[PDB]
Amino acid sequence: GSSGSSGMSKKPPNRPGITFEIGARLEALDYLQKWYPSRIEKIDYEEGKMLVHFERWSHRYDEWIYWDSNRLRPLERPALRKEGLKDE
């Protein structure tokens, strides 16, 4: 076996997709092992927990999820300055 999470685990390590930030849009793995969209309301670098909000749950349901839990995935990336978004 091999354990890491030593290189300043706190900060977001080399992750091609997910990015721990304020307002960032990503997905989180709920206790139901289900995948759903979410955002980062706040981030605690002193503790290591970030306030993430879930969309699924109709009623604005937010809960702090350790950014070092490794239970989040890189949600579909947006459109980079899409060419001529509209037509009209």
UniProtKB/Swiss-Prot annotation:
Q: Which domain of life is it from?
A: Eukaryota
Instruction: Give residue ranges for domain Tudor.
Output: 18-78
Cross-linked residues, Glycyl lysine isopeptide (Lys-Gly) (interchain with G-Cter in SUMO2): K82, K86
Localization (cell): Nucleus
Record text on subunit structure and interactions: Interacts with methylated DNMT1 (DNMT1K142me1). Interacts with SOX2.
Known function: Is a negative regulator of proteasomal degradation of a set of methylated proteins, including DNMT1 and SOX2. Involved in the maintainance of embryonic stem cells pluripotency, through the regulation of SOX2 levels.
**Protein's UniProt name:** PHD finger protein 20-like protein 1
Q: Which organism is it from?
A: Homo sapiens
Highest lineage ranks of the organism? Eukaryota, Metazoa, Chordata, Craniata, Vertebrata
Span within the entire protein? 1 to 81 of 1017
